[PDB]
Design a protein around this ligand. Sequence first.
Ligand SMILES: Nc1nc2c(ncn2[C@@H]2O[C@H](COP(=O)(O)OP(=O)(O)O)[C@@H](O)[C@H]2O)c(=O)[nH]1
Length: 168
Amino acid sequence: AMKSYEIALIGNPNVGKSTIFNALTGENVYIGNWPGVTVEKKEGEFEYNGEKFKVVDLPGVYSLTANSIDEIIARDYIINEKPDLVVNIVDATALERNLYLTLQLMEMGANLLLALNKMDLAKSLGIEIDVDKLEKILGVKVVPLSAAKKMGIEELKKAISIAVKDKK
Ligand SMILES: Nc1nc2c(ncn2[C@@H]2O[C@H](COP(=O)(O)OP(=O)(O)O)[C@@H](O)[C@H]2O)c(=O)[nH]1
């Protein structure tokens, strides 16, 4: 009946991935781990419009090399599980370093959406981001938000429903 999609959340540690995951899924959540390791695996889902969205939280990583079991898990999933959409959660207060992962993600031909979190913190720290320039330079859609202050989440949901169609 209801059409489904699979989306993955990935970014550096401490960017608000857990906060965004909870905001998107609420009570619909299973918590376990990846096979044979003590790396936590969070999965949940939300309904938006008439469509259903399975959300997998990938391990927080700084790059997608193979220097850790986390990078391995994350890379294996992105490439071999082929999610309809990778939501790359990026911290606006440390853009440069967050974008290292982003570049690798683009390399892999991930269907990508950029969630530029912590806009409040950046503003309060005097950090300026030209979101439009960023969107332009990367050729990826950028959704500014502040998940901890419950701002932009709805915007994000909408952008997700739109971005998954870009896998076709
Ligand atoms: N200022 C601010 N803090 C945030 C935001 N989102 C998350 N945080 C805080 O950043 C810290 C780490 O967030 P968390 O979701 O646990 O990050 P994760 O490690 O990427 O999963 C927590 O203290 C959050 O409250 C935001 O939009 N603005």
